[PDB]
Enzyme design. Sequence first.
Site, PDB file in Angstrom:
ATOM      1  N   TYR A 162       9.685 -28.426  32.731  1.00  0.00           N
ATOM      2  CA  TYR A 162      11.059 -28.809  32.342  1.00  0.00           C
ATOM      3  C   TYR A 162      11.880 -28.971  33.619  1.00  0.00           C
ATOM      4  O   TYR A 162      11.813 -28.139  34.503  1.00  0.00           O
ATOM      5  CB  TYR A 162      11.651 -27.713  31.463  1.00  0.00           C
ATOM      6  N   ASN A 182      16.023 -30.276  34.582  1.00  0.00           N
ATOM      7  CA  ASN A 182      17.298 -30.970  34.727  1.00  0.00           C
ATOM      8  C   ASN A 182      17.291 -31.496  36.109  1.00  0.00           C
ATOM      9  O   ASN A 182      17.221 -30.685  37.063  1.00  0.00           O
ATOM     10  CB  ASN A 182      18.452 -30.027  34.517  1.00  0.00           C
ATOM     11  N   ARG A 219      21.372 -40.104  25.156  1.00  0.00           N
ATOM     12  CA  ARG A 219      22.177 -39.188  24.313  1.00  0.00           C
ATOM     13  C   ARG A 219      23.379 -38.620  25.026  1.00  0.00           C
ATOM     14  O   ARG A 219      23.544 -38.806  26.237  1.00  0.00           O
ATOM     15  CB  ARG A 219      21.347 -38.040  23.743  1.00  0.00           C
ATOM     16  N   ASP A 246      25.011 -34.671  25.167  1.00  0.00           N
ATOM     17  CA  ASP A 246      25.053 -33.284  24.785  1.00  0.00           C
ATOM     18  C   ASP A 246      26.490 -32.828  25.100  1.00  0.00           C
ATOM     19  O   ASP A 246      27.024 -33.011  26.215  1.00  0.00           O
ATOM     20  CB  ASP A 246      24.044 -32.411  25.543  1.00  0.00           C
ATOM     21  N   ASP A 298      15.528 -34.226  32.132  1.00  0.00           N
ATOM     22  CA  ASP A 298      16.799 -34.815  31.776  1.00  0.00           C
ATOM     23  C   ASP A 298      17.552 -35.271  33.026  1.00  0.00           C
ATOM     24  O   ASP A 298      17.661 -34.496  33.960  1.00  0.00           O
ATOM     25  CB  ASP A 298      17.639 -33.769  31.020  1.00  0.00           C
TER      26      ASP A 298
HETATM   27  C1  LIG Z   1      22.977 -28.027  33.738  1.00  0.00           C
HETATM   28  C2  LIG Z   1      23.295 -28.890  32.541  1.00  0.00           C
HETATM   29  C3  LIG Z   1      22.158 -28.605  31.585  1.00  0.00           C
HETATM   30  C4  LIG Z   1      22.232 -29.551  30.439  1.00  0.00           C
HETATM   31  C5  LIG Z   1      21.149 -29.202  29.445  1.00  0.00           C
HETATM   32  O1  LIG Z   1      21.060 -27.828  29.031  1.00  0.00           O
HETATM   33  C6  LIG Z   1      21.255 -30.101  28.233  1.00  0.00           C
HETATM   34  N1  LIG Z   1      20.152 -30.698  27.860  1.00  0.00           N
HETATM   35  O2  LIG Z   1      22.305 -30.292  27.632  1.00  0.00           O
END
Ligand SMILES: CCCC[C@@H](O)C(N)=O
Lengths: 147, 153
Positions: free
Chosen positions: A50, A52, A96, A98, A129
């Site tokens: 994973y 970010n 998307r 979030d 991401d």
């Molecule tokens: C540091 C931002 C993390 C964002 C992640 O937790 C999300 N997928 O929204």
Amino acid sequence: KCEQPRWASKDPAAGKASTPDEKIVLEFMDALTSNDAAKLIEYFAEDTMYQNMPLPPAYGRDAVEQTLAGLFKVMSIDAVCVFHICSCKGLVFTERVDVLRALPTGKSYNLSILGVFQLTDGKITGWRDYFDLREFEEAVDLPLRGK
Amino acid sequence: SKCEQPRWASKDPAAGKASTPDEKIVLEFMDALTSNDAAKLIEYFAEDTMYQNMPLPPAYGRDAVEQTLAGLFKVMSIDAVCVFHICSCKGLVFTERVDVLRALPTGKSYNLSILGVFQLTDGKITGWRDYFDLREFEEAVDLPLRGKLGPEQ
Ligand SMILES: CCCC[C@@H](O)C(N)=O
Ligand SMILES: CCCC[C@@H](O)C(N)=O
């Protein structure tokens, strides 16, 4: 809090699952709002990762679970708005927003994300991401790169 | 080349190859980026289009898209594009890639990790959005781009 951006594909099918892998990923997106690393980790393969992308990657189910658990201690995912989902041999892409809330400040931001998932046999072997971290930090008055 | 595979890239070589007409157009476009030529690149775009590097404001329409690209190319060079993953569905193409960018004012280079999306209709680009972290890039090439290309947009 799911407003369309202006540029979203107009066909509502663009945001709907039409393959088994897309369907798993959409279920995973639904789960994100649990803010629960232990529930989330059940979707992952053993040999997984994973990241970010503005922050260091995590490799393996234990490290992935701990990274997510640590994220959820400082922020909450209040909603997940998927505009586009697509899949092809083992990969699924999601465009998307979030809606993220920083727990220390109470402030929210609609984080624009393009994410990619790799799967095998219905389990996640990779999730990355991509987004701009600075903009989120400044919106919710919190420095995350330190944490 | 300047093209190193990340550890996490899908092992099947099919994952980085075009197998649809939309994917093939997008890979040709990716090949063209190293031209650093906004006038050449604008040919791939529809009239009803947009471009956005997601940390900066969007451009709508061909002239704004062409001006945005021209502005970027005044200060940086795309030296290489390395596409790891490409996929298309439903008028959308997604590319996971690194662009090797060199900042002309500082001479410094950076492997920028990008996930981008293209929307197409009848073989022309109606939308192109690239997602990445702008600060990491600025700090690597010692250039505050948002300060500069932010106001520009
Ligand atoms: C540091 C931002 C993390 C964002 C992640 O937790 C999300 N997928 O929204
Ligand atoms: C502001 C950085 C833009 C990066 C972009 O020009 C690219 N390589 O597509």
